[PDB]
């Protein structure tokens, strides 16, 4: 099958390498993110099972201290909110809300940079799934033109002489869709998993803020 | 079947994935339909039983008597009443903090219900939108085998081009059959969920309003 790649015009073989490059990069990103979002989701479940054990937050805080170089996800937004709360509750505290509004800010500044620590390469797939059929079609249309440039010099033509040129040209559309389909499926799938995980972290930080307002106000 | 036994390996894979997506789509349609019927019926049954004029604390006490598998409009009410009554035990709160503590619990519990109805709808929308293009990629693959045969011999036989045509044409047949279930059901089910969300959102206004009158008077 490399026989065509060994003889075809510089542009269609260059387009072939671009599309295989997007296909390799796409599948590498799909396996990578999937492993990262699987880890981040299981680490959120494991932190919920810790938080709902009835452990006192003032000692739960001490647990994270043991891993200041490896805090992530739900436990990072807990730790960042609570490490601000201790400070806003210490000395000047203004109102019980003013200590739980500054702590909640110290959570959301770690909602971002946990999101955007995951969610990194997803918008690349959003472009690959969009342009990959157009790159395949541009390689195809150039392929038809290259065939007709060779053909039109002859006084007559038949399918027996033009059809091989068209068949080698349609490869660019076929590879163009083969690189696009995994990208459009996995972009939608992974983007929904990020929105589920964002909703989970927002549900955690709001519901934690209710326990925090209970302990600040009473 | 001998016509499929000697089909090209790429078309074998395309048939298995598209039949897989058709079977998975029909399983999702019936599964989500029984769930959305049950959830819509539970909401209509509970919200009548609640609005009947029975005492909220007696209803809450028998609802706790069924806290095992409480999911539905029952669970939404239970979450709102539980934080209302528990936050009310601390008489230091102004009534705005009490209606906050109720609406804080039930908005979280409503999202936890919707995410249990939603689960396989975005997969079905992914399949219904990409499935005819998996068919199209199989068709372009068959078109190439047809043009290769038309480029082989001075007068190609119908028997030697036919395998490319049959593979090309079946890939469009199955690409349609694996898109019918998703294109009827995805908009219908997504509209059903939006209607059932609007039902719970009307319960948010109506239940928080009676608790607002309760908090300003007790």
């Amino acid at each position: 099958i490399l026989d065509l790649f060994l003889k075809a015009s510089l542009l269609v073989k260059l387009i072939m390498l671009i599309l295989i490059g997007f296909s390799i990069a796409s599948w590498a990103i799909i396996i990578q993110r999937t492993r990262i979002l699987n880890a981040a989701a299981r680490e959120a479940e494991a932190f919920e099972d810790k938080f709902w054990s009835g452990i006192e937050l003032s000692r739960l805080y001490q647990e994270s201290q043991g891993k200041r170089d490896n805090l992530t996800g739900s436990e990072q937004i807990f730790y960042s909110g609570f490490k601000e709360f201790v400070r806003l509750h210490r000395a000047n505290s203004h109102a019980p809300e003013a200590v739980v509004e500054g702590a909640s800010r110290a959570m959301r500044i770690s909602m971002n940079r946990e999101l955007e620590n995951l969610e990194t390469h997803i918008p690349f797939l959003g472009t690959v799934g969009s342009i990959s059929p157009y790159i395949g079609l541009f390689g195809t249309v150039w392929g038809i033109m290259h065939a007709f440039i060779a053909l039109g010099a002859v006084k007559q033509a038949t399918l027996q002489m033009v059809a091989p040129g068209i068949a080698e040209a349609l490869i660019a559309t076929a590879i163009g869709l083969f690189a696009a389909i995994p990208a459009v499926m996995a972009y939608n799938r992974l983007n929904q998993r990020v929105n589920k995980l964002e909703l989970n972290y927002d549900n955690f930080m709001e519901e934690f803020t209710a326990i925090l307002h209970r302990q600040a106000f009473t | 079947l001998d016509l499929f036994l000697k089909a090209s390996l790429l078309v074998k894979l395309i048939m298995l994935i598209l039949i897989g997506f058709s079977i998975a789509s029909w399983a999702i349609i019936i599964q989500r339909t029984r769930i959305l019927n049950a959830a819509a019926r539970e909401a209509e049954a509970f919200e009548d039983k609640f609005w009947s004029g029975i005492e909220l604390s007696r209803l809450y006490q028998e609802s706790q008597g069924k806290r095992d598998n409480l999911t539905g409009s029952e669970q939404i009410f239970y979450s709102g009443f539980k934080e209302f009554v528990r936050l009310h035990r601390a008489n230091s709160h102004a009534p705005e903090a009490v209606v906050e503590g109720a609406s804080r619990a039930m908005r979280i519990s409503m999202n936890r219900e919707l995410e249990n109805l939603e689960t396989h709808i975005p997969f079905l929308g992914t399949v219904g939108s990409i499935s005819p293009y998996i068919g199209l990629f199989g068709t372009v693959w068959g078109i190439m085998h047809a043009f290769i045969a038309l480029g082989a011999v001075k007068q190609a036989t119908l028997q030697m081009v036919a395998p490319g045509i049959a593979e090309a044409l079946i890939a469009t047949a199955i690409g349609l059959f694996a898109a019918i279930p998703a294109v009827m059901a995805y908009n219908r089910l997504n509209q059903r969920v939006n209607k059932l969300e609007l039902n719970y959102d009307n319960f948010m206004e109506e239940f928080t309003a009676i608790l607002h009158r309760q908090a300003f008077t007790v």
Binding site: W27, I31 | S8
Partner: peptide
């Protein structure tokens, strides 16, 4: 870490494509 992890993901998915593109010419 992550630059080596994405390199390992590129390596394992590249050999997965090489065996698929071999299987494509094999039948």
């Amino acid at each position: 870490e992550q630059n080596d992890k994405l390199k390992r993901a590129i390596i394992i998915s590249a050999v997965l494509h090489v065996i698929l593109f071999a299987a494509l010419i094999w039948s």
